[PDB]
Amino acid sequence: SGFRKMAFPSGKVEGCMVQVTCGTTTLNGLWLDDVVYCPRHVICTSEDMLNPNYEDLLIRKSNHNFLVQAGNVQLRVIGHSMQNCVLKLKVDTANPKTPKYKFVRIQPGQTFSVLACYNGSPSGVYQCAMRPNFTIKGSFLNGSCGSVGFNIDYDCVSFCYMHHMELPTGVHAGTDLEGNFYGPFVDRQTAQAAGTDTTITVNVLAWLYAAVINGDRWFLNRFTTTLNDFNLVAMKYNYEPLTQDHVDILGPLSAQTGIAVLDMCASLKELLQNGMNGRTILGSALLEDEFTPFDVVRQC
Amino acid sequence: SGFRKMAFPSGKVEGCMVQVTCGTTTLNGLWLDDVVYCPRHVICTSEDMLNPNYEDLLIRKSNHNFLVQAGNVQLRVIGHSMQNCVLKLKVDTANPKTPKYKFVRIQPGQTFSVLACYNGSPSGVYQCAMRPNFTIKGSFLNGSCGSVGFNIDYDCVSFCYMHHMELPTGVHAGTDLEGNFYGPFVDRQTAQAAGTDTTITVNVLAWLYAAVINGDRWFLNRFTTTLNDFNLVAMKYNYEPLTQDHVDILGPLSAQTGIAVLDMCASLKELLQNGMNGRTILGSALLEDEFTPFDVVRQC
Ligand SMILES: CC(C)(C)NC(=O)N[C@H](C(=O)N1CC2(C[C@H]1C(=O)N[C@H](C#N)C[C@@H]1CCNC1=O)SCCS2)C(C)(C)C
Ligand SMILES: CC(C)(C)NC(=O)N[C@H](C(=O)N1CC2(C[C@H]1C(=O)N[C@H](C#N)C[C@@H]1CCNC1=O)SCCS2)C(C)(C)C
Numbered sequence: 001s002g003f004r005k006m007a008f009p010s011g012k013v014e015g016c017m018v019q020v021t022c023g024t025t026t027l028n029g030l031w032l033d034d035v036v037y038c039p040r041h042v043i044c045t046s047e048d049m050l051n052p053n054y055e056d057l058l059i060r061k062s063n064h065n066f067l068v069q070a071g072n073v074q075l076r077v078i079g080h081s082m083q084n085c086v087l088k089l090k091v092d093t094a095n096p097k098t099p100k101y102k103f104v105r106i107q108p109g110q111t112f113s114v115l116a117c118y119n120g121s122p123s124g125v126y127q128c129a130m131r132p133n134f135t136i137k138g139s140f141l142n143g144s145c146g147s148v149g150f151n152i153d154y155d156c157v158s159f160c161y162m163h164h165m166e167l168p169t170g171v172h173a174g175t176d177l178e179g180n181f182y183g184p185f186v187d188r189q190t191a192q193a194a195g196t197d198t199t200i201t202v203n204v205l206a207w208l209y210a211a212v213i214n215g216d217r218w219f220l221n222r223f224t225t226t227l228n229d230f231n232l233v234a235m236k237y238n239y240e241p242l243t244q245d246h247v248d249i250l251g252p253l254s255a256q257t258g259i260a261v262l263d264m265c266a267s268l269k270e271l272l273q274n275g276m277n278g279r280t281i282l283g284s285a286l287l288e289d290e291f292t293p294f295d296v297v298r299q300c
Numbered sequence: 301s302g303f304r305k306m307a308f309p310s311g312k313v314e315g316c317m318v319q320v321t322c323g324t325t326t327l328n329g330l331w332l333d334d335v336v337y338c339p340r341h342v343i344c345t346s347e348d349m350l351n352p353n354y355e356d357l358l359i360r361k362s363n364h365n366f367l368v369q370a371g372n373v374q375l376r377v378i379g380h381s382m383q384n385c386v387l388k389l390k391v392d393t394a395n396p397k398t399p400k401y402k403f404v405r406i407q408p409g410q411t412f413s414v415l416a417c418y419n420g421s422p423s424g425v426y427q428c429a430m431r432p433n434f435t436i437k438g439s440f441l442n443g444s445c446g447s448v449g450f451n452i453d454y455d456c457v458s459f460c461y462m463h464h465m466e467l468p469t470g471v472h473a474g475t476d477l478e479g480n481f482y483g484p485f486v487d488r489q490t491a492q493a494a495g496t497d498t499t500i501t502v503n504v505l506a507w508l509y510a511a512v513i514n515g516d517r518w519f520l521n522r523f524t525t526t527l528n529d530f531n532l533v534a535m536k537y538n539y540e541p542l543t544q545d546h547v548d549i550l551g552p553l554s555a556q557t558g559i560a561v562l563d564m565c566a567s568l569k570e571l572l573q574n575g576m577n578g579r580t581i582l583g584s585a586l587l588e589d590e591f592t593p594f595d596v597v598r599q600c
Contacts, residue, residue, distance in 0.1 A: 001470050002439035009415065009422035011311030115309065124306035124599070125425060137583070139304035139599060170301050170515065214470070283437070285585035299424070299439060 001214050003282045005290070006299055007113040007127045008152045015097030019069040019120035020089070020146065022061070028117045028146030029068060029089070030159070030177070032098050036068050036075070036089040037177060038146045039164045040082060041187050049189045058082050069120060070095075084179030085187050086162065100156040103177035108132045109200045109240070111292050112149040112160050119143060129203065129290040130161075132240060133195040134183025135171040138163070148177070169194050200289040201239045202246035205264055207288050209253040210296040211281045218279060220259065223266040230265040237272045249293050301514050303582050305590070306599055307413035307427045308452045313459075315397030318375070319420030320389070320446065321367040328417045328446030329368060329389070330462070330477070332398050336368050336375070336389040337477060338446045339464045340382055341487045349489045358382055369420060370395075384479030385487050386462065400456040403477040408432045409500045409540070411592050412449040412460050419443060429503070429590040430461075432540060433495040434483025435471040438463070448477070469494050500589035501539045502546035505564050507588045509553035510596045511581045518579060520559070523566040530565040537572045549593050556600075 020029035020038045024046065029038035043057045061080070066089055068075040079090035106112065111129045115122050116139065128136045128149060140147065140163055149161030163174045164187055171194055173185040185192055208219065231241040247261045254261050268287075276285060320329035320338040323345065329338035343361060344352045361380070366389050368375040379390035406412065411429045415422055416439065428436045428449060440447065440463055449461030463474045464487055471494050473485040485492055508519070531541045547561045554561050568587075576585060591599075 001441075001466065002437060002472070004424075004426040004439040005305055006416070006424035006426045006439060007307060009311075009314050009425055010309045011314040011422075014309050014311040116306070122309035122311075124304075125309055126304040126306045137302060139302040139306060141301075141600075166301065172302070280586070283586075286580070300441075 003210055003214055003299065005127050006295075007125045008150065010113065010115050010122065010125045012099040012152065012157045013115045013148065013150055014122050016095060016099070017115070017117050017120050017122060018075070021067045021069075022065055026119060027143060028120055030146070030148050030162070031068075031070060031075075031091075031095045032101055034091055034094040036091060037162070038087050038089070039162065039175075039187070040085050040087045040179070041145070041164065042087065044187075051188055051190075054082065054187075058087070071120070082179075085164065085175050085181060086177070086179035102156060102158045104151075104158040104160045105176040105178075105180065106130055106160045108134060109203060109292070110160075111290060111295055112151050114138055114149045114161070114163075115147060116140065116144060117147045127290065129200060129292075130182065131171075131194075132198045132200065134181075134185070135167060135169075135173055135194045135197075136161070138172040140166060140172055149174075167192060167194055196238075199237065199239045199287070201234055201242045201268075202249065202293065203289040203291055204239075204287050205242075205246075205250055205261070205268060206253060206293040206296045207291045208264055208268060208281070209250070209257055209259070209293075210291065210300055212257045212259060213253075213296075213300045214282065216281060219271055219276075219281060220263070220267050221270055223270070224260070224263050225266040225269060227262065227265070230262070230269060233269050233272065239272075253293055253296060303510050303514055303599060305427050306595075307425045308450065310413065310415050310422065310425045312399040312452065312455075312457050313415045313448060313450055314422045316395060316399070317415070317417045317420050317422060319369040321369075322361070322365055326419060326443060328420060328444070330446070330448050330459070331368075331370060331375075331391075331395045332401060334391055334394040336391055337462065338387050338389070339462065339475075339487070340385050340387045340479070341445070341464065342387065344487070351488055351490075354382060354487075358387070371420075382479075385464065385475050385481060386477070386479035402456060402458045404451075404458040404460045405476040405478075405480065406430055406460045408434060409503060409592070410460075411590060411595055412451050414438055414449045414461070414463075415447060416440065416444055417447045427590065429500060430482065431471075432498045432500065434485070435467060435469075435473055435494045435497070436461070438472040440466065440472055449474075467492060467494055496538075499537070499539045499587070501534055501542050501568075502549065502593065503589040503591055504539075504587045505542075505546075505550055505561070505568060506553060506593040506596045507591045508564055508568060508581070509550070509557055509559070509593075510591065510600060512557045512559060513596075513600050514582065516581055519571055519576075519581060520563075520567050521570055523570070524560070524563050525566040525569060527562065527565070530562070530569060533569050533572065539572075553593055553596060
């Protein structure tokens with residue numbers, strides 16, 4: 001038993017991390033087959049961060065303006081291409097450690113693991129959820145751009161995120177592996193802000209089920225509720241409305257505990273309305289929403 | 301910026317995980333050079349879990365009674381030995397993926413990363429602290445015994461933990477990589493329980509420094525305190541007494557923020573005496589004690 005903020009094993013991604021340097025800017029890149037992927041702001045000059053034209057910036061570059069290094073081995077760039085907000089650098093050598101992989105664009109509320117790297121070297125791994133406002137509350141310092149987020153299904157790594165920038169609120173914004181930003185964010189120093197965030201309702205319910213699986217039942221009640229009445233209450237606490245799709249997803253967890261989804265919703269409505277009364281659930285004094293129903297099943 | 305429960309990258313350990321089966325018991329082993337390490341309860345039979353004699357059980361075994369599988373290939377056991385509470389299975393094949401490594405026994409309050417594996421396959425990774433009562437609040441299911449905990453210095457893996465059993469309170473017990481249990485625990489089914497735990501004071505203070513580094517100052521105050529007066533209060537909340545060794549260790553964090561260690565102690569004293577007043581620190585409604593001063597510096 002026990003329940004932890006658990007991340008995926010990171011070895012399949014560690015073997016793909018490289019250092020990418022252009023001009024005076026160094027960040028990380030992802031080396032799959034014979035292509036190194038990295039944020040396109042690597043070619044942004046330190047004087048052109050307000051409104052750079054990346055199409056112009058890149059056409060003015062040659063292959064010898066990109067230095068890629070795998071460990072202590074320099075890779076030779078043999079061509080280059082831009083795809084939305086990321087660069088693709090073709091190299092002489094295919095990465096022999098390339099795992100089976102996919103590029104996946106994820107919905108808000110889904111989780112992934114982040115492999116935090118600096119100068120091509122992994123420093124740590126942690127679990128994130130894509131917030132409803134399309135930001136992530138990550139942990140990134142200078143030189144961390146190009147670090148990636150991912151999931152592993154069986155033996156295939158599904159890359160879903162690459163880090164680009166930190167917002168004024170202390171949260172992080174980035175793209176999928178095809179260069180498309182999550183949310184309304186752009187890679188230039190204009191006025192940008194995270195939208196109003198919301199709490200991921202289906203994840204809180206999944207996590208309450210995890211607590212029941214681990215023998216922790218104090219927060220349940222004899223009551224039930226309709227889905228519509230629950231949503232009327234949940235919205236007052238800035239929770240995502242609960243959909244029938246979410247109810248169906250929680251099905252296997254309901255079956256494991258014997259607690260109908262709407263009964264667990266009534267339990268959450270009581271927790272929201274009254275608080276935890278000084279108690280904790282799975283060691284937390286607040287309602288945790290970074291565990292999906294799939295995370296709960298996989299760990300339990 | 302940002303601050304996460306960050307674990308070490310796990311690739312160096314993943315390449316060392318194997319499956320060990322003896323009789324009808326399957327668990328994990330750690331394969332370094334030509335030796336596979338695993339809990340000695342792997343030879344404990346059903347219905348002999350109350351008072352097994354492991355010296356007597358092992359002498360009744362041959363090398364061919366141990367099956368070790370790396371990936372999908374068998375290793376040949378060519379010798380065996382017991383060292384305290386773990387078995388060493390010498391095999392014909394040396395692991396080409398053996399990292400630089402140490403075996404380290406750690407003090408309570410220190411943190412390490414846990415690579416949870418089943419049937420030789422890594423499933424996830426998370427961060428733990430050795431609790432003062434020598435248990436860990438981990439996440440382990442059936443078949444997880446033999447999973448290991450570790451730190452990475454530079455490129456060298458310091459293995460500090462191997463999982464053996466779960467206590468009736470829901471917490472876990474195990475050994476160093478030489479088979480010596482942390483705390484007063486034995487691998488036999490007699491009445492054992494976790495002792496009264498305490499909160500790791502020096503880690504809470506380190507984590508409060510991390511909050512200041514990342515912009516949370518609401519919990520600070522203009523007050524200060526003596527070390528003896530602080531310990532008089534902290535003990536009333538089931539906290540570890542703070543030593544001068546701890547104060548010295550917090551030095552670099554005091555220097556980075558400009559907040560004297562004893563000033564931060566006065567801040568923690570206020571937090572213990574009044575609560576958080578509905579606010580959070582680094583996203584937590586609880587005082588977190590699973591970050592050492594070394595972890596705070598690494599992540600900041
Ligand atoms: C745009 C907006 C106003 C929303 N904010 C910002 O401009 N923020 C900057 C930012 O992050 N930038 C700027 C660009 C590159 C990228 C970057 O290199 N950020 C570091 C990477 N490497 C990693 C940052 C630092 C800590 N945490 C992170 O993750 S993106 C635009 C064109 S240059 C700050 C450096 C945080 C001020
Ligand atoms: C002694 C004490 C009363 C304190 N507790 C226990 O007897 N606990 C058991 C225990 O863990 N045992 C039994 C032995 C081996 C070991 C084990 O096989 N533990 C699994 C391994 N693999 C992994 C367990 C499963 C759940 N979570 C874990 O981590 S140790 C004694 C001689 S056989 C339970 C199975 C949890 C009942």
